[PDB]
Design an enzyme around this catalytic site. Structure first.
Site, PDB file in Angstrom:
ATOM      1  N   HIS A   1      28.545  85.108  46.134  1.00 18.76           N
ATOM      2  CA  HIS A   1      27.548  84.585  45.250  1.00 18.76           C
ATOM      3  C   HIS A   1      28.099  84.272  43.752  1.00 18.76           C
ATOM      4  O   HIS A   1      27.350  83.496  43.044  1.00 18.76           O
ATOM      5  CB  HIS A   1      26.297  85.585  45.370  1.00 18.76           C
TER       6      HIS A   1
ATOM      7  N   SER B   1      21.970  81.239  40.378  1.00 21.00           N
ATOM      8  CA  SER B   1      20.889  82.048  40.960  1.00 21.00           C
ATOM      9  C   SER B   1      19.455  82.084  40.564  1.00 21.00           C
ATOM     10  O   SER B   1      18.859  80.743  40.615  1.00 21.00           O
ATOM     11  CB  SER B   1      21.736  83.586  40.846  1.00 21.00           C
TER      12      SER B   1
ATOM     13  N   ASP C   1      27.606  83.527  50.543  1.00 19.45           N
ATOM     14  CA  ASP C   1      26.654  84.071  49.552  1.00 19.45           C
ATOM     15  C   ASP C   1      25.794  85.179  50.361  1.00 19.45           C
ATOM     16  O   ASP C   1      24.965  84.511  51.465  1.00 19.45           O
ATOM     17  CB  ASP C   1      25.805  83.152  48.961  1.00 19.45           C
TER      18      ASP C   1
END
Length: 257
Positions: free
Chosen positions: A207, A129, A175
């Protein structure tokens, strides 16, 4: 190839939770860490094959080292020195995470435990991320980096035409935090067309696919690090051509590397 380590790979060997290298660990306190929040270094004890490439891995926004910790020994046990970092604060943004990933790598050069274990000229970055955004920032800031792997990367910066480091972009199909259309796939599309690069989308993944052990993520990270940190041609087979892997939703690659 002087940098080849370990026996020839198979599907079983790159999918293994622990590879052919026994691994130890040492912790870097936040007081011992200049420019990052500390972390844990995983490294192989077998030094008879020579020094290993080094890899730094960052978590994402609000996340601790534990959110990516499983990658540390799983990758290290394939023949790498791997530091899973904490950030100075958990609120740090991608560009700062990229500074910290680079500072973590630099720390490896003088770390008393591993400085004899590392080839300081063969280094790589990974992250999840906003940590994956930091990895892209770190590669964009350092063209000598051998490999970069953003996992479900998040970043405000979408143009990565300045990266010269072989980059594997790992998207998660479903995601919603960092949707692949506005992040991962955008990053892959802006990397130079001449760059050795690959985009891999994980079928049906959220995610958070990489905050918990995931064999697809590990096997292709290991194949990427082998191919580009070690220049290990034995691992090209898992990348080129596309693997018929049901876990993969979409695949793009500038094969052959």
């Amino acid at each position: 190839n002087p940098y080849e380590r370990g026996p020839d790979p198979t599907e079983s060997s790159i999918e293994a939770v622990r590879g052919p290298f026994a691994v130890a660990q040492t912790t870097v306190s936040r007081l011992q860490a200049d420019g990052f929040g500390g972390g844990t270094i995983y490294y192989p004890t077998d030094t008879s094959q020579g020094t290993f490439g080094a890899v730094a891995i960052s978590p994402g926004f609000t996340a601790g080292q534990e959110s990516i910790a499983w990658l540390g020994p799983r990758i290290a046990s394939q023949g790498f020195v791997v530091i899973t970092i904490d950030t100075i604060t958990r609120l740090d943004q991608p560009d700062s995470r990229g500074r910290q990933l680079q500072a973590a790598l630099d720390h490896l050069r003088t770390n008393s435990v591993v400085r004899n274990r590392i080839d300081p000229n063969r280094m790589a970055v990974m992250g999840h991320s906003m940590g994956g955004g930091g990895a892209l920032s770190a590669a964009a800031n350092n063209t000598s980096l051998e490999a970069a792997i953003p996992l479900q990367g998040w970043h405000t910066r979408k143009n990565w035409s300045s990266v010269r480091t072989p980059t594997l972009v790992v998207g998660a199909q479903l995601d919603t935090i960092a949707p692949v259309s506005s992040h991962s796939e955008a990053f892959y599309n802006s990397l130079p067309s001449d760059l050795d690069k690959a985009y891999m989308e994980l079928r049906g993944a959220s995610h958070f696919v990489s905050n918990t052990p995931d064999t697809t993520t590990a096997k292709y990270s290991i194949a990427w690090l082998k191919r580009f940190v070690d220049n290990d041609l034995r691992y090209e087979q898992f990348l080129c051509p596309a693997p018929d892997d049901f876990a993969i939703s979409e695949y793009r690659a500038t094969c052959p590397f």
